[PDB]
Amino acid sequence: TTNYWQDWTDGVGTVNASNLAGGQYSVSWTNCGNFVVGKGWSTGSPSRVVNYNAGAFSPNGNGYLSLYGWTRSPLIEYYVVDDWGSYRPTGTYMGTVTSDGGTYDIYTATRVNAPSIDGTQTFTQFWSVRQSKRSIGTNNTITFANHVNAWKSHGMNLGSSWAYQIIATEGYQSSGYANVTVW
Numbered sequence: 001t002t003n004y005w006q007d008w009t010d011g012v013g014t015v016n017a018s019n020l021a022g023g024q025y026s027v028s029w030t031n032c033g034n035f036v037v038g039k040g041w042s043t044g045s046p047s048r049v050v051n052y053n054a055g056a057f058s059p060n061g062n063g064y065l066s067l068y069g070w071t072r073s074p075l076i077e078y079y080v081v082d083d084w085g086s087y088r089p090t091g092t093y094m095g096t097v098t099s100d101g102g103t104y105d106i107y108t109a110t111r112v113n114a115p116s117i118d119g120t121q122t123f124t125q126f127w128s129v130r131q132s133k134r135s136i137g138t139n140n141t142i143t144f145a146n147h148v149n150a151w152k153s154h155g156m157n158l159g160s161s162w163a164y165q166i167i168a169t170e171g172y173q174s175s176g177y178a179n180v181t182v183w
Contacts, residue, residue: 036169063172097146
């Protein structure tokens with residue numbers, strides 16, 4: 001089961017997040033800045049099989065629902081995006097990976113002197129973004145090892161030092177409503 005609860009916001013606008021029982025959380029937001037809220041594990045693993053059921057995911061504007069986490073050395077922010085609102089995230093195309101019923105475009109991107117888990121840093125993002133939005137309200141699996149191994153094939157090697165790893169609701173200058181259970 002999950003061991004970790006993440007409730008990060010940049011403080012802009014209103015973001016209310018609830019650490020519910022077990023692997024369940026909710027978040028409502030109105031005119032946010034940036035936030036990342038979710039449940040998962042304080043130490044990520046490249047072979048974790050993650051399951052979730054989003055009882056609701058209704059961004060009004062830009063929001064993502066993703067497997068999400070960080071590694072250090074090097075500093076990498078990574079995503080497996082299953083759902084999004086008005087904006088599909090993209091970067092530099094590297095290939096695709098097919099896993100758990102979805103086909104995902106793989107992207108890289110550099111973030112230069114940008115906010116990170118260590119303040120202002122230059123770091124890299126590894127993205128798997130589903131080509132279509134996954135169904136909401138269903139029990140959904142993310143077999144993360146498939147993404148890790150697809151990324152490796154394109155030289156997107158994750159750092160050796162693992163930080164947290166969560167199914168995350170992320171908003172950018174938007175409003176919305178999400179309720180998600182993770183296991």
